Amino acid sequence: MPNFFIDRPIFAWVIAIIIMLAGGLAILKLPVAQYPTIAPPAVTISASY
């Protein structure tokens, strides 16, 4: 594989480029937060008398 791409330098470039634009496009649509969900989920029951 290294020998393969030593002979085919632009093929190696397009793999790198395709990976890179996939990544660029990913950034445009990725959510942003301080944290992911890390708190355990809670449910509250409220009643009144």
- Binding residues for another protein, rule: CB under 8 A, are 8, 10-11, 13-15, 17-18, 21, 25
Residue type, 4: F
Cβ proximity to another protein, 29 vs 41, nearer residue: 29
| Burial class of 35 by CB neighbour count within 10 A (0 to 12, 13 to 18, 19+) | exposed
Cβ proximity to another protein, 9 vs 42, nearer residue: 9
Cβ proximity to another protein, 29 vs 36, nearer residue: 29
Q: How many residues does the chain have?
A: 49
Rounded to the nearest whole angstrom, what is the least distance from the CB of residue 37 to another protein in the complex?
23
Residue type, 31: P
